[model samples]
Structures are given as C-alpha cells and as structure tokens.
Target: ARKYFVAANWKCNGTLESIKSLTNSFNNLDFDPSKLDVVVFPVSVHYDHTRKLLQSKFSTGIQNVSKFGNGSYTGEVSAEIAKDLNIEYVIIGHSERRKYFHETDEDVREKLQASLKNNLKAVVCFGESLEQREQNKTIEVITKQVKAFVDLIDNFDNVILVYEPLWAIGTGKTATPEQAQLVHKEIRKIVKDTCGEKQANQIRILYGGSVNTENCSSLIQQEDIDGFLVGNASLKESFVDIIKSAM
Candidate 1:
C-alpha cells in the first residue's frame, strides 16, 4: 500500500523568528510515522533553522532545486547541494513558480531528473487553470504534464505527485472530493501506462489546492486521494488539525 504523503509548502514564506514560531507548533505532531509521510518545505533560507526546530520524525523539503548540478550558477541551489544538506525532498513545478518565475514544462522535467540523480525524493506539482477546466480540457492538460515528467524516469521510487487545480489554489474553489479522485485516478492510469502497474500502484498522488481541516477527512477517504500539499492552511495551527484528520 502507498503511504499517505502529506506535505506543507511554505512556498515563499518564513524567517528566523517566525520560522521558530511555525516549527515550534509542529514539534508534537500527532501522527504515526509508519502510516504517514509528513514533510515540510520551508524556503531555502529557512531550511536550516526549520530543519533544526521541527521534530526529526518529520522530513524536510526544499522549495526548488537548480536544474543544473554544482557549478558557477550564481544564486542557484542545485540538487547536489540539497543532497549535501541531507534534505529529503524537493518540490518542483509548483504553480507559483510556473506563473511567477516563468518555469516551463521542460525546466520542471529536467529538475525532476536532477532530483533523482542526487537521490532526493521529489514532490512535483501539476494542475490546470480555470480556463482549461472551463474549456473541458482538464484531462488533456494534466495528462501532458504528468506524461512529460515521468517519460524519462525508469524508476518511480523517488517521486510524489501533487494535483492542485489552479482555480482552487488559494482562490478557495476546491475540486469536490470526487473530482479530485477522478484526476488522481487518471494520473494513476497514465503512470501505469508509461511505467507499468507496480510503479502506478506504488506512487502516491497528493491533492493540493485549498485543502483544509473541514474537507480534508472526506478527501482522504477517496481511493486515489493519497494526501495533501497544503498552502495557506499550513501556516496556521489548523495544519495540525488537517494531519489529525488524515491520521
């Protein structure tokens, strides 16, 4: 069985003092590590302090990784650096990065390769916009995004997928539980087709975009809805409540 992979993406949020405030709240997480995989993605600057402050039982993730390995790429943090820091995961292709920093699909695909090259697990994000959904092209968009990343990887051991519909992402129009399941189910099929059944069943596809305490329990109950990639809610105490619901 695939373990439930619940991750908190601090995105571009954190600091020395506030990172302490946030990590302090998570020290006594009430979930079983054996049954659940909990990870926190702090901005790179706070990775060290966040790692030190949070409980060791919960793993740590870097928000982004340089597509290229160590070299004279100024201001770039490569997968090798993240590996050297002993970080367990790297989040690639987040919608914010795509929208704001202008990361293309090719950029995301390369970073996934880099993550695996350095033996770090990756929480890769993909989703469609409101127009795509309105245009009835959700499946096509998500299919291509998922396909583009998994196409080159022969092994699925170090990858996790998060489906966060852009329309719902902080905008608060969450895909209904069943809707989330439909896309996740489709994602499973795409993996099974490209990689085979074993990898498909073993992969954990998380549901992101406005996942909250109120709706988390029902979302977790769906067959293919493995866990969540929380955004705003992760900064609040309700993040504990969300994990509790999953546990």
Candidate 2:
C-alpha cells in the first residue's frame, strides 16, 4: 500500500519569520511519522534556510529546478545545488509554472531528469484546465502529460504525481471526491500502461487545488486519492488538521 502524504506547496509565499513560525509548530506537533509523510515546498530562495529550521522527519522540497545542469543559466537553481543543500524533492510542471512562466512538458521532463540525475525525488504536477474539462478532454490532457514524462523518465519509484485542476486551484473551487478519484484512477491507469502494474500501484497520486481541512478527510478516504498538495490552506494551522485527518 502507498503511504499517505500531506504536502504543503508554500508556493512563493512566506518569509523568514513566517518560515520560523511554521517550522516551530511542525517541530512540536505530535504526529506519527510512520502513519503519514509530510513534505514542504518553500520558495527556492528560502529552501536551505527553511531546511535548517525544519525537523529531520519532515522533508523539504524546492518549488522549481533548472533544466540546465550547472551552467550559466542566469536565475535558475540547478538540481546539483539543491541536492547538495539536502533538498529532498523538486516540484515540476506546476500549473503556475506552466501558465505564467510558459514551462512546456518538455521542460518539465528535463527538470525531472535533472532531479533524477542528482538523486532528488520529484513531485510532478499535471492537470486539465476548465476548458479542457468542459470539452471532455480531461483524460486526454492528463494522459498526454503523463506519457510525456514516462517517455523521458524510466523509473517511477521515486516520483509522486499531483493532479490539480486549473479551475479549482486558488479559486476556492474543489473537484468533488468522485471527480478527483475518477481522474486519479485514470492517471494510475496511464502509468500502468506506460510503465507497468507494479510501478503504477507504487506511485502515489495526490489531489490538489483548494484542498482544505473541511474537505480533506473525505478526499483522503477515497481509494485512489492518496494525499493532497495544498496551497493557501497549507500556510495555516489547518495544514496540521489536514495531516491529522490523513492519520
């Protein structure tokens, strides 16, 4: 069985003081390490500093990684530096990155490859927009994205897939548990078809987009919904409540 995870995508939010507050609370919380996994992705600027303040049990991740190895990529953070600083996971293909920054699937694949080369875990994000969903192209969109990654990366053991519908993210709308599960199952099927049954079952597929304490428990209870990738709710105490619900 896949272990439950509660990942916080701080996502360009928080400062030094805010990081201290959040980490202090997490350090003191009495949650079971064995029952669930907690991963945090702070902005790239504060990755190492946050890592220092966070307890050893919780994993710290980067918001993005550079596709280039370690060269003169003006403002990019390479996977090598992230690994050296003990960063555990790298989030790639987030909708914001895809939309605003114009990150293509090919770029995401390169970043994933860079992460794998540096021995860092990847929390890969993919989802359909409202228009795609309305056009009955959700599976088509998600599968194409998944296939692009699978075509590039051979191993699935160290990868986590997060499904965040574009319309729901930061808009306070949420995909119902049923809607989330259907898409999640489809994602797993795509993995199985591309990789294999073993790989498919092993990889954890997380649901994101406006996930909060009010809806997290029922969402976690779904068979295919293994965990969450929280945004706004992650910055608050309700993140702890979300973690508790998973346990």
Candidate 3:
C-alpha cells in the first residue's frame, strides 16, 4: 500500500529557536513513521540545523535546490549537498518559485532530476491558477505540468506530486475535497498514460494549499489523495492534528 505521507513546508519561516520548537512539536506526532512518509521542509539555511534538532523517524527536506550540480554556482544548494546532509526529500515546483523566480516546468524537471539522481525523494508541487481555473484549464495546466516530470519518474520510490492550487496557498482559499480529488484522479490518469498503470496506482499524489487540522481528514478520505503538503498550519500546534488526521 502507498504509505500515508504528510509534508510540512515551513517555507522561509522559523528561526533556530523556532526550529527547535517546531522539531519538538513534530516529535509529538503519533503515527508509526514506518507507516508514514513524514517530512518537514525548512528554509535551506536551516536544513542541517533542523535535521540535527529533529528526532529520528521525522526527516528534513529542503524547500528547493539548484538544477545544476555542485559547482561554482555561489549560493546554490545542489542535490549533492542535500544528499550529503542526508535530507530525505526535496520540494520543487512550488507555485511561489514559479511565480516569483519564474521557474519553468523545464527548470523544475531538471531540479527534480538532480534530486533523484542523488537518490533523494522529490515532492513536486503544481496546480492551476485562479485565472486558469476560471478559464476551465485546470486539467490542461496540471497535465502540462505533470508531463514535465513524467519521463524522469521511472519508479514510485523517489517522486511525489502535489496539487497545490495557486488560488489557495496562504490566501485561505482551499480546493474543496471533491475538487482536489477530481484533479488528483485526473493526475493519476496522466501518470497512467505516461508512466504505466502500476506506476500510476503506486504514485502518491498529495494535496496542498491551506490544508489544516479541520479539513485534512476529509481530504485524505479521498482515495486519490494520499496525504498533504501543508502550508501555514504546518508551522503551528494544529500540525499535530493534521498528522493525526493522516493516520
């Protein structure tokens, strides 16, 4: 069975002290880590610190990484460095990175390839914008984004895809459980068509964008939605409740 997965994207938040506090909160998670693929993405600066502060079972992930490998890229954290630190997952294709950094799907593809090349698991976030949704292009947009990485995924072990509608995120707008599940189901077909039936069935597609304690159970109940890539709530005490819902 696909393990229930929950990822906390701390996203440019938290201090060293706050990192310690967050690690403490995460350590309180009630599930067997063996049955869960739980990971937390702190800001890259704190990746090492957070990993050290964390108890075993829960793992650290970097919010992003360079498409290029280790070189004189200056401030970039290449896949090699992330692997060297033993970070377990890498978050790529977040909408903010696409919007703010103008990272194209091709950029995301290369970065994802880099992570998996180093044998790190990848959590790739992609979804439609409000404009795209209004235009009835959610599937079209998500499919194109999903296609960008399909060729790179030869197996389910090192890749996870998250559907995080841009209309949501920290804006407090969330895709209703039904809405997100439909997208997830379509995404599975996209995978089935590109990768294979077995790969599609096995791949874990997570839902993000304003996921929180109140609605997590409803979302996870959908067979296609394996778990969540949580935002704001992941930073607070309610994150425990989200983890509980995952179990």
Candidate 4:
C-alpha cells in the first residue's frame, strides 16, 4: 500500500530566529514513521538549519528550481546544487511562476527534466483557475498542465502530483474533502492511462491550497488524498499536529 505523505511548504516565510526554534522543537516531536512520510520545504536560507532540524525523521524540499542548470546563471539554483544540499524534493511549475514569472510549460518541463537528471524527486503542481471551473473546464485545464510534463518524463516512478486549484490557494477557501478527492481520482486516471496500472497504483497524489491543521484531517482521511503539500500551517505548530493526525 502507498503510505500517506504530508509536505509543508513554507514559501518565503520565517526568519532565522524562528527557524532555530522550529528546528529544535521538532527534535522531540512524536510521529509514526510507518504511517506518514513528511517533507518540509523551508525558505532557501534555512535549508541547512532545516536539514539539521529534520535529522532523519523527515525529509526536506525546495520551493523552486533553477531553470538553468549549474553554472553562473546569476541567481539561479540548479538541481545539482539542491542535491548537494541534501534536499530530496522540489516544487516545480507552481501558479506563482506561471502568473508572475511568466513561466511557460516548456520552462517547467526543463526544470522537471533537470531535477530527474540529477536524481531529485519532484512534487509537480497543477490546477484549474476559478474562471476555468466556472466554465466547467476544470478537468481540461488540469489535463493540459499535468500532461505537459508526464509526456516529457520516461516514467512516473519518482514524481508526485500536487493538485492545487489556483482559485483556492490563499483565498480563505478550500476544496471539501469530496471536491479534492474528485480531482485526485481524475489525476490517478491520467496517471493510469499514461503510465500503466502498476505505476499509477503506486504513484502518490497530494492536495494543496489553504491547507492547515484544522482541515487537514478531513482531506487526509479521503481515500484518494494520499497526502498534502501544505502551505500556511507549515510555519506553525499545526504542522506537527497535521502529521500526527494523518498517522
């Protein structure tokens, strides 16, 4: 069976003082290792500290990737460097990149491909916009974003899909467990169709968007929702509670 996963993405938050306290706090946190797989995506500046904090109980991931591989890309972070830092996962093609940074599918593809080349796992993001949902084209939009990279990769062995609706993110709204599970099931269908039954059954699908400790249980309880790529709760004590509840 595929175990549950809970990934906390502390996007652009936290200062060194908080990092120290959070890292040290996790030292005594009790969790079931057999039940849940946890990964923390801290701000880049806290990578070293976070890794030290995580110890061996959990894993750490990066929020973004260096579109350009290693070398002087000015301010770029390649997969090679991320690997050297002991980071195991990277979030690629998030909405922020699409909307503000103008990241094209091609750019996401290269970053994902590069992550694989360097043997790093990817938590690739995909979702539909509010307008797309209102137009009843949710599945269509998801297909376009998800299929873009599934087509590029030779296999889905190391990739985990995170379904984050653009509209739900930080909107003080959330997809009910049923709503999130519906999309997760569709994502599984896409995986099965493209990667075969064996791989699809084994591949994990995670949900994101306004996820915190309060609603985390409902979502994680859904059979289709194998795990989550958490946002805000990651910076709070709720993160540890979220993992414990899932376990």
Candidate 5:
C-alpha cells in the first residue's frame, strides 16, 4: 500500500450481533488491501471472534497494552501477548485513558517502549482537553504530549502519531482542516527537531476527532494528515465511505 491507513477505535461499541453485521459489511465492501492499510481496534473481548471472522487482509489491534513486558501481571495485556495474537498495532495514551484512568505521560512512554521492544507498530495518540484548548493552551498541550514519548523513543519506523483533540471526538464537531493541519505541521516540526528530518517527514500523522463519512472527504485531502483514528463512525457503513474518501 501507500501507507494510507484507515483505523477504527471501536471504543466500547458493538455487540455480538453488531460485530457480525459490521464484519459482514467489511467483507462485502470492495476495498483494495494492497492499496490501503486497514485496521480495527476492538475490545479484547471480541478480538478472537473478530480475528476469526474478518479476512486475513484486514488487520486487527487492541485498544490498549500493558507498559510492562510479559510476566505475571494480572489485568494487563502485554505487548508480547498482543504480538503473539497477530495484533499489528497498539494504541497508547488515548485521551479517555488520561481523563478517566489517570494515565500520565510516563505511563504512556512505558507502554510505547514495550510496543517497540516487541516489534509491534504503535498508533499512539495525543490530544488537548477542552479546558486546555479553552485556555489558549491547545498548542502547548499538544507539544507536551508529543514530546513525552518522542523524546524517549530511539526509533519511529514502527510508530504512527494520531492527534485526536479530546473535546472534538464523538462531539459531532471537528477542527477546521486548517486547524488540524496546523497541529499536524507542528507535530512534524517537533519530530524533525527531536528525531531529525528524515524521521519527521516519514512519520504518519493522523487526525482522530469525529472522523466520519461526511467529514472524511475534506479532512482526507489535507496535506499533512495521513489518515484517521475514527470513533463512532468506525462501527458502521460510514467507515466504508471514509476509506473510499481517500481514493
């Protein structure tokens, strides 16, 4: 493919019936896996089922992973386990985890490190909360989150950064393409400054807030944005439209 990734974070959506329908919809669609990289981040509960039902061409991932390596850690899914299960990517530091689970940048750093050690690609997320944005600190907040992990990672070939403004996700609202592009360019700048120009230019920056069929057309056309980290829209026919938007 051309590294145009269409990722869906199921995020507490779907039931057995829902998943079957969704998977069927996916199978019926005429997408070129050879031309696009597609992924679904389902709850661990449905992974095995979805893994068996979806075609081999469609990749799968878990919503989160343990920062610690394999061990006797209960309630934690290690990177090793994820890799063994054929998961290609792991999402780290989603805003919900930060707001609800109280996950800090340090925790996310450890998780990302574990992902790298296991050779699993990382679809790491960074964003600013509503309060942060309202205070005119959107850029600062984004900078801090991006720096937390990039500073620690020595390699980026297996990592993709997604910018999902916390306030915009599932709110039926979105940043204007210009606003999103500004942050994307800023992230590129940060990557260049810290990791050098090659890694920066090669990195895939994704937009992850309220990405739907209706909005994907304009958003996909943005210069710096590579693709999306979709939420609610990812679980339905809209996702098909989004993937089609890229073409």
Candidate 6:
C-alpha cells in the first residue's frame, strides 16, 4: 500500500533555535509509522542542523537543488551535497520557484534526475494558476507541467507527487476535498498512462496549498489524496494536530 505521507515546508522561515524547538516538538510526538510517513524540509541553511536535532521517524528534505551536478552555480545546492549529508528528500518544481525564480518544467526534470541519481527521494510539485483555472485549463496546465517530469520518471520508487493550485497557496484559499481529489485522480491517471498501473498505484500524490489542521482530516479522507504538503500551519505547534488528523 502507498504510505500516508505528510511534509512540512518551512519555506524561508525559522532560525537555528526555532528549528531546534520544532524538531523537539516532532521528537516528542509518537506517530504510528505503520499508519503514516512524516517528512520535513527546513531552509537549506538549517538542513544539517534540523536533521541532527530531529529524533523521530521524520525525514529531512531540502526545499530545492541545482539541476547541474557541480560547477560555477555558486549559489545553488547540489543533489550530491544533499546525498553526502544523507538527506532523504527534496522538493522541486514548487510554484514559488516556478514563479519567482522562473523555473521551467525542464529545470524541475533535471533537478529530479539529479536527486534520483544520488539516491534521494523527490517530492515533485506542479499546479495550475488561478488564471488557468478560470480559463478551464486546470487539467491541461497540470498535465503539461507534470508531463515534463513524467517523461523522465523511469522508476517511481522514490518519487512523491504534489499538486498545489497557485490560487490557493499562502492565500488562505484551499481547494475543497472534492476539488483536490479530482486533480489527484487525474494525476494518477497520468502516471498510469505513462508509467503503468503498478507504478501509478505505488506513487503517493500529496495536496498542498494552505493545508492546515482544520482541513487536513477531510482532505486526507479523500480516496485519491495520499497526504499533504503543509505550509503556514506547519510552523506552529498545531502541526501535531495535522499529523493526528492524517492518522
């Protein structure tokens, strides 16, 4: 069965001390491993520190990475360095990266390839913009975005797919359970068509964008939504409640 997965994307938030506190909160909780999987991505500067502070089953991931192996990309984190640090996961193709930094799907694809080559699991993200949604291009946009990476996914073993509608992220707007599940189901069909039924069933699809303790249970209860990629709510103590909601 696909493991229920929950990930906290701290984004650009948290200092060393705060991260220590967050990890402490995680360590104190006793979530059932058989029932769910919990993962975290702190700022890259704190990746090593957060990993050392954590004492639970939670896995640490980087928010992003360079598509290139190693070179003059002076400001980029490489997948090789992530592997060297024994980091277990990485988030790529996030809408912010695609919007603010102008990252194309091809960029996400190479970054994903780099992560897999280094034996790191990747939570690949893609979604439609409000404009796209209004234009009735939700599936069309998501399929095009996901297709860029799907073509590169020869093995789905260490990959997690996340769908974060741009209209909802950080804006207090969330796709309703039914709305999220529809997209998730379509994503699964994309996988089934590209990688076959077995890999499709195995790959977990997570919903992102304003996922909080309040709505997590309903979202997770939907058959197609495997779990969540939490945002603002993840930084607070109530993250525990979100975890509980998943279980």
lDDT of 1: 0.86
lDDT per residue, candidate 6, 23-61, as tens digits? Answer: 888788898766788888999888779888887577789
lDDT of all predictions, in order shown? 0.86, 0.87, 0.87, 0.82, 0.84, 0.87
Candidate 4 has its poorest 10 consecutive residues by lDDT at: 150-159
State TM-scores per candidate: 0.95, 0.95, 0.96, 0.93, 0.93, 0.95
- If the candidates were sorted by their lDDT against the true structure, best first, what order would they fall in? 6, 3, 2, 1, 5, 4
Candidate 4 lDDT, tens digit per residue, 1-247? 7778888888889888898787677656777666777888887878887887676887888889987887889878999998787678899988777888988888888899999988889988889888788799988888888778886565554788889877676565657889999989998888878778887788788887778778888888887888898877788865787887677
Q: Which stretches of candidate 6 lie over 4 Å from their true place?
A: 170-174
Could you tell which candidate, 1 or 4, scores higher by TM-score?
Answer: 1
Error of 5 at 147 (Å): 1.4
Whichever of 4 and 6 has more TM-score, that candidate is: 6
Tell me the number of clashing residue pairs for each predicted model. 0, 0, 0, 0, 0, 0
- In model 3, where do residues sit more than 4 Å from their true spots? 169-174
RMSD of 6: 1.5
Question: Runs in model 4 with CA error above 4 Å?
Answer: 32-34, 152-157, 170-173
- Candidate 6 lDDT for residue 54: 80
What are the runs in model 1 whose C-alpha is more than 4 Å off? 170-172
In model 2, which residue pairs have backbone atoms overlapping below 3 Å?
A: none
Candidate 4 residue pairs that clash? none
Query: Considering TM-score, which of the candidate structures 2 and 5 is the better prediction for this target?
Result: 2
Worst 10 residues of 1 by lDDT: 167-176
Q: How high is the lDDT of residue 126 in model 1?
A: 94
lDDT of 1 by residue, 156-247 (tens): 65788989889766565667998889989999998898889999998889998677788998888899988999988888766888888767
